[PDB]
Design an enzyme around this catalytic site. Structure first.
Site: not given
Ligand SMILES: CC(C)(C)c1nc(-c2cccc(NS(=O)(=O)c3c(F)cccc3F)c2F)c(-c2ccnc(N)n2)s1
Length: 258
Positions: A15, A20, A22, A35, A123
Site C-alpha cells: 500500500i 514509519f 511499510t 505495517k 503528523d
Molecule cells: C501507506 C499509508 C497511507 C501511510 C497507510 N497506512 C496505513 C496504516 C497501517 C497500519 C498502521 C497505521 N497507523 S499506526 O501505525 O500509526 C497505528 C498502529 F500501529 C496501531 C494502531 C493505530 C495506528 F494508527 C496505518 F496508518 C494504512 C491503512 C490502515 C488500515 N486500513 C487501510 N486500508 N489502510 S494506509
C-alpha cells in the site's frame, strides 16, 4: 499477549509507507493492514507514542496484534475505501455539506480522545483520515521520529516549520493540521495551489507571510465553520482553540444546520 501465531498472516499488495514502516494489505481473520517495521522502530513507537496500548475508540485505527516471524509487523484493522486526501484531491468525490461537517466532527472526536489520553499525533494530514466504508473516520499513521541531526509540509504549523524548538509539537500543532484538513473539506482543494516552490511555501508559512486563502471556501459553508477554521489556523499557537472547544463548536454547528 497480542502475538499472532507464526505463519497465520498472508501478506498481499504493498500500500505504501507513512511516518514509519511499510504497509501491506493482508489476510488474518479477514482483511487486515500489515505495517512492517524494525524492533527499534516498534520499541520507539511503544515509548514515544504508545497508541497500540492506549487507544480503543471508533475514530482511531484499531490495533489487532503483532507478528514476529517471518518479519516483525503491526497488524491493524483494514479500512474499506479511501483516505480523505484521495477522496478530495485524487478522485474528486463531491460530498454534501452535511457529510463534510460530519467528517470534521468525527476527526475532532478522535483527536479530542487522543489529546485526553495525552497523545499528540505529530503528523495529521488528509491521507491519515481514512474513510472506512465511506462513513466512519479512522485516524492512523502516527508520527514517529526516525531521523536525527548531523515530507508533507502543507499541514505543518509555522512553529513546526521554523523548528527553533527541539520538540515544536503540541496539541496546538495538531489543531493547526486539523485546520488545514477543515480547509480541504470546505474548499475541496489543497492550500497554496498558486505556488510551485516547496522551499518558498516552507519559508513563508513559517515566517507568517503565507496563510490559506479562506475566500476559497464553498458558498454553502457555514459562517461558524469558516470562523472555527480561522481560529485553528492562528499563526500564534497560543491563539488556537483545543479539541474539547473545537468539538463543541462543530457539534453545535451540526444541529443548527437546516
Ligand atoms: C501507506 C499509508 C497511507 C501511510 C497507510 N497506512 C496505513 C496504516 C497501517 C497500519 C498502521 C497505521 N497507523 S499506526 O501505525 O500509526 C497505528 C498502529 F500501529 C496501531 C494502531 C493505530 C495506528 F494508527 C496505518 F496508518 C494504512 C491503512 C490502515 C488500515 N486500513 C487501510 N486500508 N489502510 S494506509
Amino acid at each position: 499477549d497480542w502475538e499472532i501465531p507464526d505463519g497465520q498472516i498472508t501478506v498481499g499488495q504493498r500500500i505504501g509507507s507513512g511516518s514509519f514502516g511499510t504497509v501491506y494489505k493482508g489476510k488474518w481473520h479477514g482483511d487486515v493492514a500489515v505495517k512492517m517495521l524494525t524492533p527499534q522502530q516498534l520499541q520507539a513507537f511503544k515509548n514515544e507514542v504508545g497508541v497500540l496500548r492506549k487507544t480503543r475508540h471508533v475514530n482511531i485505527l484499531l490495533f489487532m496484534g503483532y507478528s514476529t516471524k517471518p518479519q516483525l509487523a503491526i497488524v491493524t484493522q483494514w479500512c474499506e475505501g479511501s483516505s480523505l486526501y484521495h477522496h478530495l484531491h485524487i478522485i474528486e468525490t463531491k460530498f454534501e455539506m452535511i457529510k463534510l461537517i460530519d467528517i470534521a466532527r468525527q476527526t475532532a472526536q478522535g483527536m479530542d480522545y487522543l489529546h485526553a489520553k495525552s497523545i499528540i499525533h505529530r503528523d495529521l494530514k488528509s491521507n491519515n483520515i481514512f474513510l472506512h466504508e465511506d462513513l466512519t473516520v479512522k485516524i492512523g499513521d502516527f508520527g514517529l521520529a526516525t531521523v536525527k541531526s548531523r515530507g508533507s509540509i502543507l499541514w505543518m504549523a509555522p512553529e513546526v516549520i521554523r523548528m527553533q524548538d527541539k520538540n515544536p509539537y503540541s496539541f496546538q500543532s495538531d489543531v493547526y493540521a486539523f485546520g488545514i484538513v477543515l480547509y480541504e473539506l470546505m474548499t475541496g482543494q489543497l492550500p497554496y495551489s498558486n505556488i510551485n516552490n516547496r522551499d518558498q511555501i516552507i519559508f513563508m508559512v513559517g515566517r507568517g507571510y503565507l496563510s490559506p486563502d479562506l475566500s476559497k471556501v464553498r458558498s454553502n459553508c457555514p459562517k461558524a465553520m469558516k470562523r472555527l477554521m480561522a481560529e485553528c489556523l492562528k499563526k500564534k499557537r497560543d491563539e488556537r482553540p483545543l479539541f474539547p472547544q473545537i468539538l463543541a463548536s462543530i457539534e453545535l454547528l451540526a444541529r443548527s444546520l437546516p
